Design a protein around this ligand. Structure first.
Ligand SMILES: [Ca+2]
Length: 121
């Protein structure tokens, strides 16, 4: 009831972990269809939850998150225009993804799974 069916809750947030691949932009459109957006990780607490959650899921797959790198600055932004902290910078158009315990960087036009996030009721 705070979260949709098939979604997982942590505090104010609900998350959906995909079982299909898409490119970064299309993954975002998939989240948008569900009234959500690609996962944004704004704290160590949330990162720890996300890494913990994926560990319960087979494989150490790649999951798009809502981070993209400007082609002029090289600077990372979440899709709401906020900057990640120095603890959540992807390791070295380009977009970010989570794999196991790490945030990494990839060409946006590649196929990965994705994680969506929306506010719980
Ligand atoms: Ca978040």
């Amino acid at each position: 009831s705070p979260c949709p069916n098939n979604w997982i809750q942590n505090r104010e947030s609900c998350y959906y972990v995909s079982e299909i691949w898409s490119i970064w932009h299309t993954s975002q459109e998939n989240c948008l269809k569900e009234g959500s957006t690609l996962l944004q990780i704004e704290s160590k607490e949330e990162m720890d939850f996300i890494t913990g959650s994926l560990r319960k899921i087979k494989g150490s797959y790649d999951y798009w998150v809502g981070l993209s790198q400007d082609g002029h600055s090289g600077r990372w932004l979440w899709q709401d225009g906020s900057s990640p902290s120095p603890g959540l910078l992807p390791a070295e158009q380009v977009c970010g993804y989570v794999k196991s315990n790490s945030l990494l960087s990839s060409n946006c036009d590649t196929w990965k799974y994705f994680i969506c996030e929306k506010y719980a009721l």
